[PDB]
Amino acid sequence: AAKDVKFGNDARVKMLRGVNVLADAVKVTLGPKGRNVVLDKSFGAPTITKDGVSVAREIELEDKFENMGAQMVKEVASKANDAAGDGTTTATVLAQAIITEGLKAVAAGMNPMDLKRGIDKAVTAAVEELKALSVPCSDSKAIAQVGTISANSDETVGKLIAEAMDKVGKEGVITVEDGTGLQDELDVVEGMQFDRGYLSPYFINKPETGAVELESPFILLADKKISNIREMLPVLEAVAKAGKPLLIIAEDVEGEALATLVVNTMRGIVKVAAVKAPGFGDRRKAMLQDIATLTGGTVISEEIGMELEKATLEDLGQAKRVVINKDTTTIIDGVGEEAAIQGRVAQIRQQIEEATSDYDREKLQERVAKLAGGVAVIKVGAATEVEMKEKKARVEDALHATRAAVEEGVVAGGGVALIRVASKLADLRGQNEDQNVGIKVALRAMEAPLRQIVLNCGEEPSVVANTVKGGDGNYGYNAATEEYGNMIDMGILDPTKVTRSALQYAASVAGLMITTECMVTDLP
Amino acid sequence: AAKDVKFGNDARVKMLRGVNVLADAVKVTLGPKGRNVVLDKSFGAPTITKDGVSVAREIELEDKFENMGAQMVKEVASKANDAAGDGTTTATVLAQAIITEGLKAVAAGMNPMDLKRGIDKAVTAAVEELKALSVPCSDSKAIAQVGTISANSDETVGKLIAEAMDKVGKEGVITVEDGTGLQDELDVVEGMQFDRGYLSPYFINKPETGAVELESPFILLADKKISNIREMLPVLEAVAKAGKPLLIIAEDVEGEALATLVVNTMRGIVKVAAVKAPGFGDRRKAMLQDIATLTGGTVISEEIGMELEKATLEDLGQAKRVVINKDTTTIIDGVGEEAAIQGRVAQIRQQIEEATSDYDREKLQERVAKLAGGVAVIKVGAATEVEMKEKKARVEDALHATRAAVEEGVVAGGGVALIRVASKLADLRGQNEDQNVGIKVALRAMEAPLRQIVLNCGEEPSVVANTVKGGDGNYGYNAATEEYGNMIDMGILDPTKVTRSALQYAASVAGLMITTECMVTDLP
Amino acid sequence: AAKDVKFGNDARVKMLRGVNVLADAVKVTLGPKGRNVVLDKSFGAPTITKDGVSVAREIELEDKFENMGAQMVKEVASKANDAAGDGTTTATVLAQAIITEGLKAVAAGMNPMDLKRGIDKAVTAAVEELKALSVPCSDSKAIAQVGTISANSDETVGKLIAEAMDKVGKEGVITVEDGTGLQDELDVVEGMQFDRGYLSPYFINKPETGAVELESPFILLADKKISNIREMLPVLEAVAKAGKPLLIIAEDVEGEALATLVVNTMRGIVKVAAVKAPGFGDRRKAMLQDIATLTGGTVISEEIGMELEKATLEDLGQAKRVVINKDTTTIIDGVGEEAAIQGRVAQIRQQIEEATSDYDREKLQERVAKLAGGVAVIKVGAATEVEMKEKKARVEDALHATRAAVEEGVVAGGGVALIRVASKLADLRGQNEDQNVGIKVALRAMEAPLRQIVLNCGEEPSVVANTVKGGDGNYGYNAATEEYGNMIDMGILDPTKVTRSALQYAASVAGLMITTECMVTDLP
Ligand SMILES: Nc1ncnc2c1ncn2[C@@H]1O[C@H](COP(=O)(O)OP(=O)(O)O)[C@@H](O)[C@H]1O
Ligand SMILES: Nc1ncnc2c1ncn2[C@@H]1O[C@H](COP(=O)(O)OP(=O)(O)O)[C@@H](O)[C@H]1O
């Protein structure tokens, strides 16, 4: 298509309207006095959210040039989120701020390429400063405070996160999903358990639960489909002699084999149960191996050239108890010595280290938890669906910020950390005067989040900023209680990694943007 | 697509118009002096209805913002309905109320997030208050009153519901369907019966009904298709010796087997009949098991490795009489001891407890009824189809409210319960003044349903509310007889669970709503 | 789609223009001075008709609201017709009347829900009153009078209907179809006959008719296709010995068998004929059973495990004569004793009682006639096609009204019955004044049909109604002769069931309609 090209101040002015429409939709939500935005949906009911990256992905503008502005700053908000899943509004606010100020200096006749260099120097400096202010967050109380503050001041989320973090340990997963009732609820599953039900409801020796239960059972791990019962006989009978029940975790148990197993368990011959293997594809075999290790058994796959028939009792895993539902098997307390348990865990330790992907990382951490600590699920309660969505998202949001606190620390919120690092770099200079403005451009933007937080309360940003600026260390403004104080004492903690990412990402794009001199796009 | 974004008072005004159009099409229908709305349909004739969620789901507006408003309140009405099938208009009315008043206070310059906290606090309070006013509704008289009142003052609906509730008992289903004539009619099927006709009209030993009848018959339950008669012989002959007739409920009876059975029953050899199994898929086998239990027989499926041939008389169920039509089998009085009956019922008791779905819940409750109490059908009469639709809906509607009465109790209608819980909270306060206004915003809306009820009679809401406000307990206004009195004595009872759900849902959304500060949506 | 919602008097006004455009197109046709409407057709030539439900179905309006109007009153005319195939214009006229009046009182500020209650009470009362004026119509003369009056005063239709009703008896069908010439013609087939021709034109022993004729023939009823002649031999030869001819009614006679039969009959071996079974699917077997009964033969189907070979002469049905054309077999006078005939008829008597369908009802009544009375056909004559359509329709129309007279009786026409029940309810009252207007609203509409009859004559409705109102019993106005008199004596009889369905249906929807307060529909 034919293009519309626009140059210099003209192009920039459109660019900024672009940034501004997005920035302004995203700002309304900053801080405890944040407000919500409503994003429409051709789908079904609209969505009410407080979450900056949600609002930001929706903004698309009709003027092709305004649009390019908005589609650019939009990535600060987006990246901020893939990085720590929080602080996306802050980020946006900082970029709108670096760009506003920067462009105004380009209009003063400064060389943008230097404005940029100064802005990045300013920033690299601020990042060190942050790492210096950061203090570790490692007690349950602090963790609760980052949760809480992330969840727009929902003390309950704070607590629940803090609680879960506590039970599943350091290497345990926590996930959030819709709840049944109105109140939030925390499930913690003990030890190892996966997503597989009995293959026939006949195995069920306890109908009141609708679930199967065996004690001191041997476990047969077969990495292959099971059709012929012939393959079993030498084994099933070695077990009938030891007088103990048996779990069968194979790739699958089909008609011919299953039917007969079902007939055999029924008549009170040998107590048995069978259930599909966890997952599919490649991880199945590796994850079935997990199960081997935990119960001290040997995987029987046709890959190492093995036959079910040639398997003595010894190959079988063992545990003290197992529990299986319509769609959930669980092994309690495996015989595997913690020598071998700890070892296999020290292997899947480095699986994550060289997991060059994001999805190849999730699963490994899951397995680590099923073998080491525990798995926790939070359920968010809500009266409505418009409510579930927003509430769920905040818990999700805070879940992330705590994980961030834990690895990177905390600094004073209400954008005090940033305002503080700005005074620490009051003396930073670059290779030339433009660069010095460039630096000053960033220091000034570093006041933005506190300034919006305040404006969203309907008081005066420059009065609050002045008195915060007049103090020291962690003195800051409590927007919620409208009083000044020590931000760490008041429990207003930002996870250091988020304050940091918001600065980096926002500067990284704002930086580029202010060096636009030409813009090319389609004809209306 | 390029978006239109709107901010603050601007966006809200539009949002309100949107709420308002919907809320006012819903209002017209509130209470005994309600009027109906006509909803068009590209389909066939329009639809006349009084039912608030029906009107609501139709409203869609041309201003994309006004629409957003409307599509949002629309969920209070919707949720209300998935929750108790009733009170949807009240709900709507309350939300229109909480919003109007709430936005007015945002324009006052209150912090909407607090307005929300006050509103919720006000509501959590009001729910407790209602659970306190609730009294159990458990006689047949009260039940009739809830029915009656739900069916816009139709005493006959009240009575039929009350009557059915009484015969099918507490674990019995009641369903409504179109009737043949002009008058309503209540069918109650006694004990166990399902949707299956004879497999050949030849079995029919009584042509005058066009139906089959056997006394003291054995029952053969086969969980498998039946093609070969060979499989039958050992059994059919053990039955010919005992001189009793035989029912065959299998997965199916096809050509070869059936034909011969048909030939055998014909010649006066052995009195037999055959009929498909109930349902399909997985429930068939479980439900066929029901039939086993009720008649004290043993299911014969190839899954436990069983053969028809190896079945003595003993495996066969038995009853005192069976009745089968073109499409309805029914077993009268099974031999199964109530020891085993009561037990299998205590199992399907907890099937519903862990039925994590809505459709996996319907079927279980059905079976419970076929095994415990009874099944009842109501037929709604009407001269026309425009009439049938509206009348059927109301019966359905009241059917729901009585089920709600029964599980959660009744409170005073005419929106007296709500007006009373508002004076109980005259002292509620929150953390800060905005929250106090927030609280007051809700208490105020709690007057809405009575004030519409009154307006819809064309008298003066604030006069009626003032004198109701001036009494005590259950004094209220009888809009139908235009006189004051005790609302429970006058049989104007609301089911507690609906009054409460109306409040909850409407507050739940209106609450979020009043905290919109930005709105994003498409270009016209 | 975005909707256009309309509220109170506004939405009503549009609703009523709606009812009006329809009501008016329908009115023009009412009574003997009725006129015709022309309804266009993308198809072929337009359609000239007098028939209210025909005009009505066409009306659809451009104003989405006016349209709703129209599409709703449209249902009175529609139901009216499914219910007694007549009175549909009167119906229409009463609804336009109940609406007009009703709405005018909602404008007075009555409570429409009560307007409605009184309009129904009024009506329930009127229906009793009609059942009380109704006198049975059971001589051939009165029957002619209902036909005649139904057929816009076509004495010839009256007569023909009366004539048929007389010959086919009470359980005989009468159908109307296009005729060959210009004059109407009544065919009456005697006894049993169906739609099947010889399977080979060679069977024909009388070429002058082009048809087959056998006397004292045995009848072979085979419920199965016939391919092998082997299956026949034992039988064909038992018949060759008795020296009588043979009819073969099987599911079909194909190549191999047929060919040989054809060769055998040809050479003067044994006199035989063959013809397909009546209908297909399930009724075939049941209907072939009919033929069995009538001729005292035994159906030979492989379903009861039977073979053609094992059939002696005894199994064969018998009659005194049979007559078969290119597409019509007919059996004259079967040997079956009326003990068994009457019985099988007493079974298909209750087939109709429990025929829960409309199509499962037509066939049964057919069979009843082929076994009990006779079948009659009327042929309508016309010069043109524009003419055949309208005439045929009227005969059809009157065919219905007579069937209705016969089951429910007659009342005085020209709208006199309704005007008389109206003075009988002069004292009816309801629970409150609004209901009293509502009563009075209906009693007034009850004058509508006489008022239109008169206006269609171009005289003055309120002079005619005054004088008619001034008389008694069956005094009324003969619109055709423009003189007053006793309407029963002048043969102006309306079948009671129609006068009552007109009232029922019109009030049933008019009733709802006047309780519209909102109307929702699409944007233009
Ligand atoms: N009581 C409070 N006073 C001042 N700031 C607060 C208070 N509570 C939370 N905050 C601050 O709110 C800021 C961000 O909240 P949020 O609106 O989610 O922005 P983001 O999406 O950028 O995380 C953090 O700086 C946190 O310090
Ligand atoms: N005689 C009456 N006087 C005052 N209120 C009544 C009377 N009869 C019924 N109501 C009130 O009607 C209200 C609801 O009727 P309805 O129009 O179905 O609204 P909803 O759809 O909100 O259930 C209930 O609060 C009930 O108390």
Ligand SMILES: Nc1ncnc2c1ncn2[C@@H]1O[C@H](COP(=O)(O)OP(=O)(O)O)[C@@H](O)[C@H]1O
């Ligand atoms: N000579 C007559 N005088 C008055 N009314 C008549 C006369 N002939 C027929 N009618 C009346 O005509 C009315 C209906 O005829 P018709 O136009 O078909 O209306 P509908 O479709 O409503 O049957 C009946 O009420 C019948 O009594």
Ligand SMILES: [Mg+2]
């Ligand atoms: Mg945040």
Ligand SMILES: [Mg+2]
């Ligand atoms: Mg209701």
Ligand SMILES: [Mg+2]
């Ligand atoms: Mg007529």
